[PDB]
Amino acid sequence: SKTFIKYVSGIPDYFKQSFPEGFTWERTTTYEDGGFLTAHQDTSLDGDCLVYKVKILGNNFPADGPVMQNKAGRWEPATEIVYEVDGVLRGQSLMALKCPGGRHLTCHLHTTYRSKKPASALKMPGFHFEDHRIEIMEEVEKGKCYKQYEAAVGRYCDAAPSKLGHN
Amino acid sequence: SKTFIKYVSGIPDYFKQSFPEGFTWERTTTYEDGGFLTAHQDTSLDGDCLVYKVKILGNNFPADGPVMQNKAGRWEPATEIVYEVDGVLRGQSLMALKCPGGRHLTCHLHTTYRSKKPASALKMPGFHFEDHRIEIMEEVEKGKCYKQYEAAVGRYCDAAPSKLGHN
Amino acid sequence: SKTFIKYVSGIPDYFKQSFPEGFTWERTTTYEDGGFLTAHQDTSLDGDCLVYKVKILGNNFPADGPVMQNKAGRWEPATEIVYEVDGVLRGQSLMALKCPGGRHLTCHLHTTYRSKKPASALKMPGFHFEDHRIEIMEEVEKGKCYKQYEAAVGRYCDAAPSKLGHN
Amino acid sequence: SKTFIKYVSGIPDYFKQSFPEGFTWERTTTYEDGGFLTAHQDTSLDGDCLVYKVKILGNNFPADGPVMQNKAGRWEPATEIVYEVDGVLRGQSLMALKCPGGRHLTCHLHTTYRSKKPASALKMPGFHFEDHRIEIMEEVEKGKCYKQYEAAVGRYCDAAPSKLGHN
Amino acid sequence: FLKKTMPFKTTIEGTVNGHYFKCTGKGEGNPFEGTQEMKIEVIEGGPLPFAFHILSTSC
Amino acid sequence: HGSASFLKKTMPFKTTIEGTVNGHYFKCTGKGEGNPFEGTQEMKIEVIEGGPLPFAFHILSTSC
Amino acid sequence: HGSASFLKKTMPFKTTIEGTVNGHYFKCTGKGEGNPFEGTQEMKIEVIEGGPLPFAFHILSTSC
Amino acid sequence: FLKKTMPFKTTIEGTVNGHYFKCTGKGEGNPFEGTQEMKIEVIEGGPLPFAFHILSTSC
Numbered sequence: 070s071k072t073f074i075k076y077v078s079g080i081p082d083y084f085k086q087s088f089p090e091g092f093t094w095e096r097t098t099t100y101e102d103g104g105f106l107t108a109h110q111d112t113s114l115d116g117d118c119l120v121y122k123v124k125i126l127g128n129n130f131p132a133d134g135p136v137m138q139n140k141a142g143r144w145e146p147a148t149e150i151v152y153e154v155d156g157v158l159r160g161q162s163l164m165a166l167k168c169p170g171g172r173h174l175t176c177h178l179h180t181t182y183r184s185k186k187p188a189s190a191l192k193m194p195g196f197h198f199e200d201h202r203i204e205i206m207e208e209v210e211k212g213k214c215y216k217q218y219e220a221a222v223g224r225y226c227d228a229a230p231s232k233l234g235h236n
Numbered sequence: 237s238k239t240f241i242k243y244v245s246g247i248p249d250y251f252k253q254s255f256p257e258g259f260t261w262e263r264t265t266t267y268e269d270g271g272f273l274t275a276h277q278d279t280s281l282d283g284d285c286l287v288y289k290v291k292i293l294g295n296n297f298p299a300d301g302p303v304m305q306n307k308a309g310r311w312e313p314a315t316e317i318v319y320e321v322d323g324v325l326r327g328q329s330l331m332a333l334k335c336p337g338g339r340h341l342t343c344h345l346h347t348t349y350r351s352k353k354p355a356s357a358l359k360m361p362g363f364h365f366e367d368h369r370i371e372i373m374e375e376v377e378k379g380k381c382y383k384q385y386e387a388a389v390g391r392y393c394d395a396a397p398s399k400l401g402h403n
Numbered sequence: 404s405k406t407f408i409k410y411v412s413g414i415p416d417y418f419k420q421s422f423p424e425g426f427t428w429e430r431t432t433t434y435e436d437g438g439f440l441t442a443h444q445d446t447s448l449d450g451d452c453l454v455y456k457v458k459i460l461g462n463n464f465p466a467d468g469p470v471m472q473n474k475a476g477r478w479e480p481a482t483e484i485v486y487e488v489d490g491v492l493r494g495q496s497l498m499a500l501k502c503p504g505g506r507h508l509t510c511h512l513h514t515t516y517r518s519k520k521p522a523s524a525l526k527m528p529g530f531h532f533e534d535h536r537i538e539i540m541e542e543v544e545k546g547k548c549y550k551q552y553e554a555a556v557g558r559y560c561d562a563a564p565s566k567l568g569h570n
Numbered sequence: 571s572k573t574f575i576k577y578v579s580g581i582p583d584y585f586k587q588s589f590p591e592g593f594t595w596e597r598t599t600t601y602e603d604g605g606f607l608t609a610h611q612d613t614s615l616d617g618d619c620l621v622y623k624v625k626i627l628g629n630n631f632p633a634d635g636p637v638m639q640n641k642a643g644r645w646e647p648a649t650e651i652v653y654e655v656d657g658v659l660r661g662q663s664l665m666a667l668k669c670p671g672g673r674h675l676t677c678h679l680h681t682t683y684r685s686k687k688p689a690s691a692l693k694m695p696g697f698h699f700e701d702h703r704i705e706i707m708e709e710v711e712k713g714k715c716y717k718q719y720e721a722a723v724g725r726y727c728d729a730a731p732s733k734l735g736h737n
Numbered sequence: 738f739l740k741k742t743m744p745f746k747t748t749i750e751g752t753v754n755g756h757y758f759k760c761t762g763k764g765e766g767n768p769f770e771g772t773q774e775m776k777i778e779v780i781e782g783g784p785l786p787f788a789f790h791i792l793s794t795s796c
Numbered sequence: 797h798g799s800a801s802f803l804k805k806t807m808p809f810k811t812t813i814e815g816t817v818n819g820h821y822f823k824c825t826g827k828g829e830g831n832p833f834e835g836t837q838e839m840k841i842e843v844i845e846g847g848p849l850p851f852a853f854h855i856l857s858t859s860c
Numbered sequence: 861h862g863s864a865s866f867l868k869k870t871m872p873f874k875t876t877i878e879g880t881v882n883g884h885y886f887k888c889t890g891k892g893e894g895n896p897f898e899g900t901q902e903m904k905i906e907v908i909e910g911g912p913l914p915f916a917f918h919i920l921s922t923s924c
Numbered sequence: 925f926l927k928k929t930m931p932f933k934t935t936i937e938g939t940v941n942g943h944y945f946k947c948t949g950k951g952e953g954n955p956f957e958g959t960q961e962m963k964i965e966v967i968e969g970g971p972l973p974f975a976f977h978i979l980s981t982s983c
Contacts, residue, residue, distance in 0.1 A: 070745065070764075070766070070773055070775075070796060072739070072743070072768050073766040073767070073768050073771055073772065073773040074768075074771045075769065075770055075771030077562075085739055085768065088738045088739060089738045093819050095293070095295035095296070095816075095818070095819065096295065096794070096795075097264065097272040097274065097295055097296065098791075098794070099266075101604060102603075103346070103602060104791070105264040105272075105274065105346065106753070106791050106792075106795075107264065107272065107274035107293045107295065108293070108751075108794075108795045109293050109295070109816045109819075110795065114738055117740070117743070117744065118743075118744045118745060118746060119743060119744070119745035119746070120745070120746055120747075121745060121746070121747040121748070121762075121796075122747075122748055123747060123748065123749040123750070123751075123795050123796075124291075124293060124749075124750055124751065124816065125749060125750070125751025125752070125753065125792065125795055126262070126274045126275070126276050126291060126293050126751065126752055126753075127751065127752070127753030127754060127787075127791060128262035128263065128264060128274065128276070128346075128348060128753070128754060129262065129264065129326075129346055129347075129348050129754075130753070130754050130787065130791075131321075131322060132322035132323075132324075133322065135788060136787050136788045136790075136791055137754060137786070137787055137788075138788075139785075139786070139787060139788050140788070141788035141790045143569075143790075144790060144793060145484070145530050146559075146560035146563060148482045148532065148560070150479070150497055150499055150509075152499065152507050153505065154298075154506075154507070155298065155299035155300070156299075159296075159507075161497050161509065162497070163484055163495050163496070163497060163511075164794075165484055165486065165530065166788075166790055167530070171487065172488075173486050173488070173493075173530065175484075175495065177497075177511065178794065179270070179272065179295075179296050180296075181295060181296050181818070183819050196479050196499065196501070196507065198482065200560050200562045200563045201563065201794075202560060202563040202564070202565060203793045203794070204565065204566060204567055204569070205789070205790075205793075206566070206567075206774065208789075209776070210784075211784055212779065212783055212784020212785045212786075212789075213778065213779045213783040213784050213785075214776065214777070214778050214779070215776070215777045215789050216774065216775070216776050216777075217774065217775055217777065217793060217796060218566055218772075218773070218774045219772070219773055219774075220563035220564065220771055220772050221563060221771045222562035222563050222771055224562055225480075226480035226482070226534050226536060228411075228534045228556035228558055229480060229534045229535065229536040229554035229555060229556050229958070230536070230554065231536060231538065232538060232540070232552055233538055233540075235477075235538070237809065237828075237830070237837055237839075237860075239807070239809075239830070239832055240807075240830040240831065240832055240835055240836065240837040241835045242833060242834055242835030243835075252832065260755050262752075262754070262755065263858070263859075265855075265858070268437060269436075270435060271855070273817070273855050273856075273859075275815075275858075275859045276752045276755075277859065284807070284808070285807075285808050285809060285810060286807060286808070286809035286810070287809070287810055287811075288809060288810070288811040288812070288826075288860075289811075289812055290811065290812065290813040290814070290815075290859050290860070291752065291814060291815065292813060292814070292815025292816070292817070292856070292859060293815060293816055293817075294815065294816070294817035294818060294851075294855060295817070295818060296818075297817070297818050297851065297855075302852065303851050303852045303854070303855055304818065304850070304851055304852075305852075306849075306850070306851060306852050307852070308852040308853075308854040310736070310854075311854060311857060312651070312697050313726075313727035313730060313732075315649045315699065315727070317646070317664055317666060317676075319666065319674050320672075321673070321674070328664050328676065329664070330651055330662050330663070330664060330678075331858075332651060332653065332697065333852075333854055334697065338654075339655070340653050340655070340697060342651075342662065344664075344678065345858065348754070350755050363646050363666065363668065363674060365649065367727050367729045367730040368730065368858075369727060369730035369731065369732060370857050370858070371732065371733060371734060371736075372853065372854070372857065373733070373734075373838070375853070376840075378843070378847055378848035378849070379843065379847050379848020379849055380842065380843045380847040380848055380849075381840065381841070381842050381843070382840070382841045382853050383838065383839070383840050383841075384838065384839055384841065384857060384860060385733060385836075385837070385838045386836070386837055386838075387730040387731065387733075387835055387836050388730060388835045389729040389730050389835055391729055392647075393647035393649070393701050393703060395701045395723040395725055396647060396701040396702065396703035396721040396722060396723050396899075397703065397721065398647075398703060398705065399705060399707070399719060399721075400705060400707075402644070402705075404932065404951075404953070404960055404962075404983060406926070406930070406955050407953040407954070407955050407958055407959065407960040408955075408958045409956065409957055409958030419926055419955065422925045422926060423925045427883050429627070429629035429630070429880075429882070429883065430629065430981070430982075431598065431606040431608065431629055431630065432978075432981070433600075437680070438978070439598040439606075439608065439680065440940070440978050440979075440982075441598065441606065441608035441627045441629065442627070442938075442981075442982045443627050443629070443880045443883075444982065448925055451927070451930070451931065452930075452931045452932060452933060453930060453931070453932035453933070454932070454933055454934075455932060455933070455934040455935070455949075455983075456934075456935055457934060457935065457936040457937070457938075457982050457983075458625075458627060458880065458936075458937055458938065459936060459937070459938025459939070459940065459979065459982055460596070460608045460609070460610050460625060460627050460938065460939055460940075461938065461939070461940030461941060461974075461978060462596035462597065462598060462608065462610070462680075462682060462940070462941060463596065463598065463660075463680055463681075463682050463941075464940070464941050464974065464978075465655075465656060466656035466657075466658075467656065469975060470974050470975045470977075470978055471941060471973070471974055471975075472975075473972075473973070473974060473975050474975070475975035475977045477977075478977060478980060488632075489632065489633035489634070490633075493630075498981075500975075500977055512981065513604070513606065513629075513630050514630075515629060515630050515882070517883050535981075537980045537981070539976070539977075539980075540961065542976075543963070544971075545971055546966065546970055546971020546972045546973075546976075547965065547966045547970040547971050547972075548963065548964070548965050548966070549963070549964045549976050550961065550962070550963050550964075551961065551962055551964065551980060551983060552959075552960070552961045553959070553960055553961075554958055554959050555958045556958055563771070571873065571892075571894070571901055571903075571924075573871070573873075573894070573896055574871075574894040574895065574896055574899055574900065574901040575899045576897060576898055576899030577899075586896065594942050596939075596941070596942065597922070597923075599919075599922070605919070607881070607919050607920075607923075609879075609922075609923045610939045610942075611923065618871070618872070619871075619872050619873060619874060620871060620872070620873035620874070621873070621874055621875075622873060622874070622875040622876070622890075622924075623875075623876055624875065624876065624877040624878070624879075624923050624924070625878060625879065625939065626877060626878070626879025626880070626881070626920070626923060627879060627880055627881075628879065628880070628881035628882060628915075628919060629881070629882060630882075631881070631882050631915065631919075636916065637915050637916045637918070637919055638882065638914070638915055638916075639916075640913075640914070640915060640916050641916070642916040642917075642918040644918075645918060645921060665922075667916075667918055679922065682941070684942050702922075704921050704922070706917065706918070706921065707902070709917070710904075712907070712911055712912035712913070713907065713911050713912020713913055714906065714907045714911040714912055714913075715904065715905070715906050715907070716904070716905045716917050717902065717903070717904050717905075718902065718903055718905065718921060718924060719900075719901070719902045720900070720901055720902075721899055721900050722899045723899055730835075
C-alpha cells in the first residue's frame with residue numbers, strides 16, 4: 070500500500086507521482102524454510118478512494134512450519150532497498166517473523182514497482198531505504214477478520230554518514 | 237502434465253493412483269538472472285478427458301534477458317528429484333534454456349504435488365528421478381500458437397549403480 | 404571489524420562484551436549474478452591492538468561481470484538484521500554495489516558471530532539493525548593498496564514507530 | 571575427484587584432456603536449512619599419482635540440523651548438469667541426504683571447473699549430465715577414519731530421447 | 738488527486754498450499770504522514786488454514 | 797491388469813491458463829493427447845487474450 | 861589408443877584437506893585408487909587435526 | 925580492555941576464481957563512535973584481478 074509513505078530528505082515519491090493513472094507491483098517472497106509467496110497488485114484511484122486488486126500464489130510452505138501451523142508471532146520492522154532498474158523501480162528486503170521458541174523465520178522479498186505513467190513523466194528517486202513497520206492490531210475473528218497497521222518512511226542512511234558527500 | 241510418465245523399476249505412480257479424484261501441483265521456478273515464475277495447477281478427470289486449470293504469476297524478469305527479449309532457444313532435457321515429505325511429494329530440478337549462440341540460462345524448480353486421495357489410500361514412491369524431454373515442435377503463429385511435446389520417465393540412477401543394493 | 408560500532412538505545416554490545424577472549428565470524432555472501440564469497444575471521448586482542456586473521460574463498464564470479472572485470476563503483480550503505488539463534492548471533496543483509504551503466508549488483512550476506520565467552524557470560528542483544536557505511540577512500544596503488552573507511556551504528560527502527568510498544 | 575568418470579556417447583572428457591597440467595575446481599553448496607559449504611581444490615599429477623589439495627569453509631549450519639547433530643544417513647545418487655560458460659565448465663546439481671527415518675535434506679551445488687590448459691587446447695563437451703553415486707562404505711573410527719566409494723558417468727538423457735536429433 | 742487523509746479498498750484472491758481464499762478490505766491512512774490501518778475480511782476459504790502474516794505485505 | 801492389451805493406450809486432455817508476467821496479463825487454452833504408460837504427449841496451446849506474448853513461451857512449458 | 865589394453869587400468873591419488881566448519885578447524889589426509897575409464901574409485905580419509913569431527917562427514921564427500 | 929581509540933592489524937589469505945592472494949592491513953578507529961579506517965596491502969597475488977569491493981566486509 071505504497072502510496073502511504075513519508076519521504077524525508079527530498080527523496081522523490083514514485084508512487085504519489087503515478088496518479089491519477091496509478092501503478093502496479095509484483096513480488097516473490099522466498100522463505101528460509103522453503104515457502105514461496107508470489108503476488109501481483111494493481112493500484113488505481115476511483116474518485117476519492119484508492120482501490121487495490123491483488124492476486125496471490127503461495128506454495129511449498131512446510132506442513133510443520135510456523136506458517137501452516139498458524140503459530141507465528143509478529144513481523145519485525147523491515148528495511149527495503151529501492152533503486153531504479155530497467156526504467157522502473159526494484160525493491161528488495163529481508164523480513165523476520167518472530168515465532169515461538171525464540172525463532173525468527175526470515176524471508177527475502179524481490180519486488181518490481183511499475184508506474185502507469187511513462188518513465189519520461191517521472192522524477193526517479195535515487196537509491197534509498199524504505200522502512201515498513203507492520204502490526205496486527207487485532208485478530209477480530211480467528212482466521213476470518215484482522216486489523217493491520219503500517220507506518221513507512223523513505224530515507225537515506227542518516228545514522229552513519231559519508232566522508233565523501235554520498236547520500 | 238504428470239499423468240504421462242513411464243515408470244520403470246517398479247516405482248509407484250503417485251499421479252495415476254490419484255484418479256478418479258485427481259491431483260494438484262504448485263511450483264516456483266527461480267531463474268539465475270532474477271526472474272520468478274510461479275504456478276498452481278488443478279488436474280481433474282472429466283469422463284475420459286483430463287482437464288487442467290492453471291494460474292500463473294511471473295515477475296522480476298530482466299528487460300534485457302532472454303525471456304523478455306523472446307530470444308530463448310530450447311530447453312535441455314531435465315532431471316527432477318522426487319521424494320516424499322509431509323505425506324505429499326516434493327520435486328526439484330535444474331533446467332537450462334539453450335539460447336541462440338549456445339549460452340545456457342538456468343533455473344531451479346521447487347514443486348509440491350498433492351493427491352486428492354488421502355496418503356493412506358496411496359502407495360508412495362521412494363526417492364527417484366523423473367526425466368522430462370520438452371520440445372516446442374512448432375511455433376504455428378506469433379506469439380499465439382504453439383505445439384509442445386514431452387517424454388517423461390520415472391527411474392532410479394541406473395548408470396552409476398550402488399555396491400550395496402540401494403536404489 | 405565489528406568492535407567498531409556505535410550502539411544506541413541501550414542495545415547490548417555482543418562484540419565489546421567478548422573481550423579479552425575475542426570472537427569469530429563466518430559468512431557466505433551470495434551475489435545475484437552467481438558469485439559466492441565465503442569468509443571465516445578470528446578477532447583477538449594482543450595487548451593494546453586488535454588482531455584479525457581472515458580466510459577467504461570466492462568462486463563462480465562471472466568472467467564478464469563487474470567483479471572479475473574490476474569495473475565496480477562503490478557500496479551503498481547497508482543495513483544488517485541481527486538476532487540471537489542457537490545461543491550465538493545471526494546476521495543477514497542485502498548490499499548493493501553501484502556499477503557503471505546505472506547498475507546495482509546486489510548480494511545477500513549470511514553471517515554467524517560467535518563470542519569466545521560462553522553465552523551465560525553475555526547480555527544478548529534483542530533483534531536490531533546494524534547500519535554499515537563502507538567507503539574506499541583511496542586506491543593508492545592499482546590492485547595493490549587501498550584505504551577503506553567504515554562507520555557503523557546499532558539501532559532500532561526509529562523512523563517508523565510502533566503502536567504496541569515494540570522496539 | 572573428476573578424473574574418474576566413464577564418459578559415454580562420445581562426450582569429450584575435460585578432466586582427462588587437462589593432464590599433465592591438471593585442473594582446479596571451486597564450489598559452494600547451499601543447504602535447504604541454511605548451511606553453506608565452500609571448497610577450492612587443486613588437482614595435479616605427480617609422476618603416476620594424482621595429488622589433491624583442498625580448502626574448505628563451512629558456515630551457518632543450524633545447531634539442531636542433521637549436519638551438526640552428526641545424524642545424516644547417506645547421499646542419494648546425484649545428477650549434475652555440466653556445460654560451458656566463459657571458456658570453462660560450470661556444473662550444478664541437487665543432492666539429497668537420506669536421514670535416519672527417511673526424511674531427505676537437500677542442497678544445491680554450484681561449481682566451476684578450470685583446466686590448467688588454455689581452452690584453445692581442449693575439446694569442450696556439450697551440455698550433458700554427470701551421475702555420481704557416493705557411498706561411505708565404512709566409518710572405520712570415530713569421527714576420524716572413513717572409506718568412501720564413488721561411481722560416475724557422463725552421459726546424455728537417454729531415457730527420454732529427442733524426436734528431433736538433439737542430444 | 739491526493740489528500741491528507743485517504744480511504745482505500747482491497748480485493749484479494751489467492752491459493753496457498755492448494756487452499757483457495759478470497760478477501761475484501763477497507764482502510765484509511767495519511768499518505769504524507771506514512772501511516773495507515775485497514776480491516777481485512779476473509780469472504781471465501783475461511784477460517785484461513787495458515788498464518789495471516791504471509792499476506793501482510795500484500796493487503 | 798494382465799497385459800498391456802487391457803490398458804488405455806491414449807488419453808486426451810484440455811487446458812486453460814491465466815496469468816500475469818511482468819505486468820502483462822494473458823489467457824490460453826490448449827488441447828492434447830498422450831500415451832499414459834509410454835509417457836509421451838503432445839498439445840497445441842492457443843493464446844486467446846494478451847497475444848502475441850511479449851515474453852518467451854518457454855517459461856510456460858512446465859505449466860501448460 | 862587402439863584398444864583398452866593400452867589404457868592405464870588404475871591410477872592412485874592422495875589428498876590433503878584443511879578447513880573450518882561452524883568455527884571448528886580440522887585437517888585430513890587421504891589415499892585412494894580408481895579406474896579412470898570405468899569411472900570408479902575408493903579412498904580412505906583420516907582426520908589428523910580436529911577429530912573426532914563434530915559434524916557429519918557427509919558434507920565433505922564431494923570434496924575429498 | 926577497550927579504549928576510545930584502538931589500533932588493529934589484519935592478515936588475509938584467499939582464493940577467488942582460482943586466484944590466490946594474501947594481504948596485510950593496519951588501521952585505527954574509535955570503537956564507541958563506530959568509526960574506523962585502514963590501509964590494506966596486497967603482498968602476494970597482486971595486482972588483484974578482481975574488484976577489491978568483494979573483500980570490503982572481510983578486512
